[PDB]
Design a protein around this ligand. Structure first.
Ligand SMILES: Cc1ncc(C[n+]2csc(CCOP(=O)(O)OP(=O)(O)O)c2C)c(N)n1
Ligand SMILES: Cc1ncc(C[n+]2csc(CCOP(=O)(O)OP(=O)(O)O)c2C)c(N)n1
Ligand SMILES: [Mg+2]
Ligand SMILES: [Mg+2]
Lengths: 562, 562
């Protein structure tokens, strides 16, 4: 008949397919955490710090749909904020629950630990409101279940973080269990019928008239859950389809009509030409950040641009506020095959040639490696690349179909990927134990978040941790200060990290040549995700993908400009 | 004739005795960081993450006077905020400089990396304003030197964090070098003459009448720079002097008139009675947090309480807003000996007896260890204790004279002390390379910030890192959930951390018995700060100082109260 408010939270999370909860304990959340163990199929990660926990919640949300992190008042929540902010920037639905002091402690303005010593229990909530879609600070048991449901709905449908403050005393108060028998509404509201109809009809007419239409899939294609619709759009139209760095993985790269990665002036020449020659651009989920675009270098020759967005549409100069692309895309599928019936297929650019055979002893280089990496990948992989040479290089890697890419192109917080790897691995394990999680992280970035490897070990998760050892911050050495001491790092014994954190079942490997790379990555044993692995990749100090070399120049000039 | 704005910053920091600068590089601060190397006697720490950098700037400011951390826009600054908030809470003067996008980038609202993708370049500044005494976002080269000076002054005189945003383009613009020839004013403004005179006259008359007066030194005695005055006060009056947990170290514990650590009902019975029987209490810098006071358990019998504060005075129920204790204390010293001439010295509580001799095989226990630790400490030591059993236990340790204690009793952010140890060690090195820095940190807390040991190694700093291995979060097990899985941690090979982070010159040790403790800590070579050392201390899971046992129960009740 009745259930505690705390247990209610976890029953709801279970209902929306959140089965791992991230964060760290503190006195203000201990009673809440007890309730996780009362709900079958729910687990507590036990993270090594709160920033890493937030990065992990982000990775989990990307793979699973949404996530939850629980921290403690003041010290826990503020530690998480850079993780939360990146989830806001990149449209990832993370529910941040904070255990806060009891209603009686607040009213008395007790001078408690984890406060600023000034009796203000609102300050941290106010800070988080700047990087949250919405917030709730629970004060009343009577409306608490509805507020929890609102927070969960909002997280999922907006794909932005939400803040939920839960006083320690209130988590043990009873609420009606029958509320759980009615699901949370997790669907978008329908579009205005007339605006949506106008949008669809206009697009259909533009399509019918187009001789060289192209589809360009970007970040929000993935973040706002229109990958299936976009796949169908590609199939029904047969139009050339391109992807951006931030959207990579959102469309299938083995599809015959896939044309490559468009990055404005930093694209391969054949890709730049094929996109920019279009007489109609169907742009799905654009997010035109500097690193996503070669510092805003798009040069479309057409004005016939259709922008699909989560919350609005644009066609040429016409804006349609509130018209959500999810339903526009779904409804377009009804008639688009007929609209596109007269289309004579335009050729798409060929895939970059495979690497030529070279002696085994050939030292490893970045360009070779990213072009070779496609041999190792398999359908279903999660492929995560850290800001630095890795994020820029992965753009040159060809993915199998059904590859989930994670690259934080906009927020760009180094260290993100160690935590994101943990969260992605938990989610992948829940979906299919055979799904591999593959990380490319720099030696510099690893240092910021290295302890989260501990949490991977404790749960027996089996990611591939490729660490690019180029003796420091190479991306920055190219931007400014190639020999500057601030671009150098203390040298760690990377392969000792796993046993130092208590790993028992693991493998470590070092690769420095093309022969060593191929021998390891082609090995059948290595390709089974049977245990956690670290692979230290030895690369030259100043070696970087050519797109990064060019971006670095642009970024340096942007910052130095008067 | 002219100096870049960036170089001006570092010349000013040098003038105010800030010689190590904390933080991490990013494109928005690289040109600024170049300027550190242009000023002799300035160094860049090269931290392993920004949170740890902020914790280190806090430890450095505690020992040296103030500090500076430099981060990059968005991702760097938000990572630091829990460090900054702890510095705000505990009154530590940390200057947080953020490299921000160029003026032209901001004006054009470029969709740059490390933004929320909404064109708002003010959001992180607004967030930091909640935990800063003041802020500055530089936009104008003409007033930039004055703004830098204002931020530096405010950091020092208020001992709170200050936020200073520096656009990347402006750091390379020239300012007049002659401005450096006039020092920044680092002094307090005089008190209101009439108010201060009333306060001094009243205190003096209370003194003359007191038969059992006592001095109680608390957090702000140390934080607001009245240790010297307090020492004089103790000497001129001969009144019994007691200290709080948060103020421990602020008064010399080998002074004949030192009476012990007062923590309300959690004090030794002799100490409680000695303080509470007073007919006058001279309270220097009170900060009455839960952990500092046994949950607000002070039971003063007298109404004759004089509260000295940085920014005001209180005498009985009378408040004197704006009357700063620094000048009150200085001026009191002129007449206090005369006022106290009739005082017949009251006995002070005796020191806790030394541990009884026991056989070498006796397992280590917390109560024994904290009592024994006094044998190892020497004058000039910096002694740092992490939130957890360490912070509670260090209260039971007797300090030599001139010992600097660091315990973050109010903010209580676990992990703080790894960073604080780094910062304290840099500062200690600058003051006197013979000063030892001694850290007691729990196994749980170490996990949050472990990578900062790397930065200690890279600079050849030589702290003693005592790690209390009690297999998890013992403090929390005593509050709630003694066997709860959230209070358990992944087991690390602690002694392998130093070599994993590239240490070459170091020692590691394990102690589990009284014999092993005494053999190690009495050893002559061990007592020399010749190299970095880690000591893993094996302690029982449920063993804790008695004051923590009681505090845990009070805290659990406070949170669970309806
Ligand atoms: C939290 C945070 N701090 C600082 C930066 C600035 N930054 C961007 S890339 C980078 C260096 C990455 O170095 P590494 O991981 O070694 O990559 P690589 O050498 O392969 O380029 C830094 C410090 C950042 N992006 N995020
Ligand atoms: C950043 C942060 N996260 C969580 C907490 C809550 N907390 C307080 S004490 C503690 C456990 C400390 O454990 P450990 O360092 O092993 O100390 P000990 O076992 O000696 O008590 C935790 C998790 C905190 N204070 N700060
Ligand atoms: Mg590197
Ligand atoms: Mg412990």
């Amino acid at each position: 008949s009745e259930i505690t408010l705390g247990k209610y939270l976890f029953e709801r999370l279970k209902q929306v397919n959140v089965n791992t909860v991230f964060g760290l304990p503190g006195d203000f959340n201990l009673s809440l955490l007890d309730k996780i163990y009362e709900v079958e199929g729910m687990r507590w990660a036990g993270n090594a710090n709160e920033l890493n926990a937030a990065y992990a919640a982000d990775g989990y949300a990307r793979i699973k749909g949404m996530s939850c992190i629980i921290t403690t008042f003041g010290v826990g929540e503020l530690s998480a904020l850079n993780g939360i902010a990146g989830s806001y920037a990149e449209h990832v639905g993370v529910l941040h629950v904070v255990g806060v002091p009891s209603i009686s402690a607040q009213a008395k303005q007790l001078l408690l630990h984890h406060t600023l010593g000034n009796g203000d229990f609102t300050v941290f909530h106010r800070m988080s409101a700047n990087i949250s879609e919405t917030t709730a600070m629970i004060t009343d048991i009577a409306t608490a279940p509805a507020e929890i449901d609102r927070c969960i709905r909002t997280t999922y449908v907006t794909q932005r973080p939400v803040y939920l403050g839960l006083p320690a005393n209130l988590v043990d108060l009873n609420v009606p269990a029958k509320l759980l028998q009615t699901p949370i509404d997790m669907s978008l509201k329908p579009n205005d019928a007339e605006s949506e109809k106008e949008v669809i009809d206009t697009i259909l007419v533009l399509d019918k008239d187009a001789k060289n239409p192209v589809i360009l899939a970007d970040a929000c294609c993935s973040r706002h859950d229109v990958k299936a619709e976009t796949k169908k759009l590609i199939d029904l139209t047969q139009f050339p389809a391109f992807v951006t760095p931030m959207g990579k993985g959102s469309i299938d790269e083995q599809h015959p009509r896939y044309g490559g990665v468009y990055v404005g002036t930093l694209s391969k020449p054949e890709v730049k030409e094929a996109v920019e020659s279009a007489d109609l651009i169907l742009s799905v989920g654009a997010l035109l950040s500097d690193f996503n675009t070669g510092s805003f270098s798009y040069s479309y020759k057409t004005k016939n641009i259709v922008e699909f967005h989560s919350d609005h549409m644009k066609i040429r100069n016409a804006t349609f506020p509130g018209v959500q692309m999810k339903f526009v895309l779904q409804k377009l599928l009804t008639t688009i095959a007929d609209a596109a019936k007269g289309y004579k297929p335009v050729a798409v650019p060929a895939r970059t040639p495979a690497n030529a055979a070279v002696p085994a002893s050939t030292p490893l280089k970045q360009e070779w490696m990213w072009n070779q990496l496609g041999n190792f990948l398999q359908e279903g992989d999660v492929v995560i690349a850290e800001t630095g040479t890795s994020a820029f290089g992965i753009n040159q890697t060809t993915f199998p179909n059904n590859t989930y890419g994670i690259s934080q192109v906009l927020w760009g917080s180094i260290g993100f990927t160690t935590g994101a790897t943990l969260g992605a691995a938990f989610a992948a394990e829940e979906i299919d134990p055979k799904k591999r999680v593959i990380l490319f992280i720099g030696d510099g970035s690893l240092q910021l978040t290295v302890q989260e490897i501990s949490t991977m070990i404790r749960w027996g998760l089996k990611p591939y941790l490729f660490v690019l050892n180029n003796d420091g911050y190479t991306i920055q050495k190219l931007i400014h200060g190639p020999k500057a001491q601030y671009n150098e790092i203390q040298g760690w014994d990377h392969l000792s990290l796993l046993p130092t954190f208590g790993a028992k079942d693991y493998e470590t490997h070092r690769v420095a040549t093309t022969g060593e790379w191929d021998k390891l990555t082609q090995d059948k044993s290595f390709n089974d995700n049977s245990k956690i692995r670290m692979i230290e990749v030895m690369l030259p100090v100043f070696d970087a993908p050519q797109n990064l070399v060019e971006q670095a120049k642009l970024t340096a000039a942007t910052n130095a400009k008067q």
